[PDB]
Design a protein around this ligand. Structure first.
Ligand SMILES: CCC(=O)NCc1nnc2n1CCCC2
Length: 93
C-alpha cells in the first residue's frame, strides 16, 4: 500500500496552465525556507524551478508516465523528461 510522500519521490506535478510536469519531492536544506503546512517543495525537472504543492496535484511517476511522459512543446519539458528518466536524484543547482 502507498506511504505518504517523502523527499526523493518522483512525480508528475500539476499546476494551473501547465501540462502535468516531471518533478521530484525535494528536501529542505538546513537553514532554508520551509513550505506552508500540508505543502511539499516540488522541484520541476527541465525548468529547475521550485513550487509548493499539495498531494492533490502530485501524481506518482511510475503509475502516470504512460499518460504524461510524452514530449511537449513547452519550454524545459523535454529536458525534464530526460532528467526524470536518466538522473532524477542529481544536483541541478
Ligand atoms: C514553478 C515556477 C513558476 O511559476 N514558473 C512557471 C513555470 N515555467 N515552467 C514551469 N513552471 C511552473 C511549474 C512547471 C515548470
Amino acid at each position: 500500500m502507498p506511504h505518504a510522500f517523502k523527499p526523493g519521490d518522483l512525480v508528475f506535478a500539476k499546476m494551473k496552465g501547465y501540462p502535468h510536469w516531471p518533478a521530484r519531492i525535494d528536501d529542505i536544506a538546513d537553514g532554508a525556507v520551509k513550505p506552508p503546512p500540508n505543502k511539499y517543495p516540488i522541484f520541476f525537472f527541465g525548468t529547475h524551478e521550485t513550487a509548493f504543492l499539495g498531494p492533490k496535484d502530485l501524481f506518482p511517476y511510475d503509475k502516470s508516465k504512460d499518460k504524461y511522459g510524452k514530449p511537449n512543446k513547452r519550454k524545459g519539458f523535454n529536458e525534464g523528461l530526460w532528467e526524470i528518466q536518466n538522473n532524477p536524484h542529481a544536483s541541478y543547482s
